[PDB]
Every structure is written in structure tokens, then in C-alpha cells.
Write a protein that binds this DNA or RNA. Structure first.
Length: 50
DNA sequence: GCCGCCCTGGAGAATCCCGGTGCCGAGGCCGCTCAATTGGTCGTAGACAGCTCTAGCAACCGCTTAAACGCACGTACGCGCTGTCCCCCGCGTTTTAACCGCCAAGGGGATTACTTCCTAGTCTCCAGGCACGTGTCAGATATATACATCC
């Protein structure tokens, strides 16, 4: 899911538009460069509560 | 008497149609906001008139002479046909890199706002460079006259 670390990518816009009840991210490095990547991951998981 | 095989009826599920509701593209509405509008003033660009001098124009003349035109001939070249061979095209197969999607940070450049100062516009005055006309002067050109010479 570090490939999903950028919110402006085409994969993020493609996967975030899916109609899925429960999502899950499997990775080894949740934070790589800054807090913004972790913000993108937790906004992919829960869009708004964080 | 017992068991196996052929014919026909009603109930369960798939599909078409309609209504209620949510999402994409576009238009009406609102707000900022800066550039077009309006009004007034003034300077000057250009219209108008006038006089002078030079070029153009229509229609004719006359003369010269070189260019244009007509004609005959001839032959060189455009064009058509045929051969030939070679090179480009079509197709099948394999490779490969364009394309799209990704970092990773950093600089270039477009804006917005602000400050400052140097330089170019503007004005006044003046003088010398440019345009025109002319007197004069040295180089180029043509002939007048004297000397050596052939028949």
C-alpha cells in the first residue's frame, strides 16, 4: 500500500471511487518520507475522521 | 396379479416494463472589480482656399530603321513502344521501445506587491551640417609648326 502513498496518483483516484464496504491496506512501510503519506493512507481507509 | 413405459396438466422461476431516486453537464445567479463610459477642456491635424510651376494626355504629324512577321525547309527531339532487371512492396515473425504510471528533490519562471533611481521625454536656445550655387584650377585632348628622311 506504499504505492498508494500519493493521493494525487491515478491508482488512488481509481481505488477510492470503488463501492467497497470494508477496505484494508497491507504494507511494511506505512510512513516513508513524511506525514502526508500516512495521511493519504488513513484518508484512503477512513475519509474524514482523521 | 405385479411391474415397467408413454401421454398430458398446473405450479415455480426468468424477463420486460414502469416508477422513484441519485449523479454528470450546463445554465442562471451572485459577488468582485477593473476597464469601458460619460462629461468637460483644450490643442492641433487636417480640411479648405490660393498661387506657381511642371508633368501627363488626347489626337494628330513626319522620319528612320530595326524589330516583327510570314514562309519554306530540315532535322532534332518529344513521344510511344518494348524489354529487362531490380528494387520496393506485401506479409509473416520477432524484438523493442514508446507510452503510461511512478518516485525524489530542486531550480526556473509566472504572478502579486513594493521600493527606488536612472534615464528618456520635453522644452528652450543656438550653431553647424546639409543642400544648393558658383569661381577657379589642374589633367586630358586636339592641332600648329619645325626637323629627318625616301623617291
Amino acid at each position: 500500500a506504499h504505492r498508494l502513498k500519493n493521493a494525487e496518483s491515478s491508482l488512488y483516484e481509481s481505488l477510492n471511487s470503488f463501492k467497497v464496504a470494508n477496505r484494508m491496506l497491507i504494507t511494511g512501510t506505512p510512513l516513508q518520507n513524511n506525514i502526508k503519506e500516512l495521511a493519504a493512507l488513513v484518508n484512503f481507509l477512513m475519509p474524514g475522521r482523521f
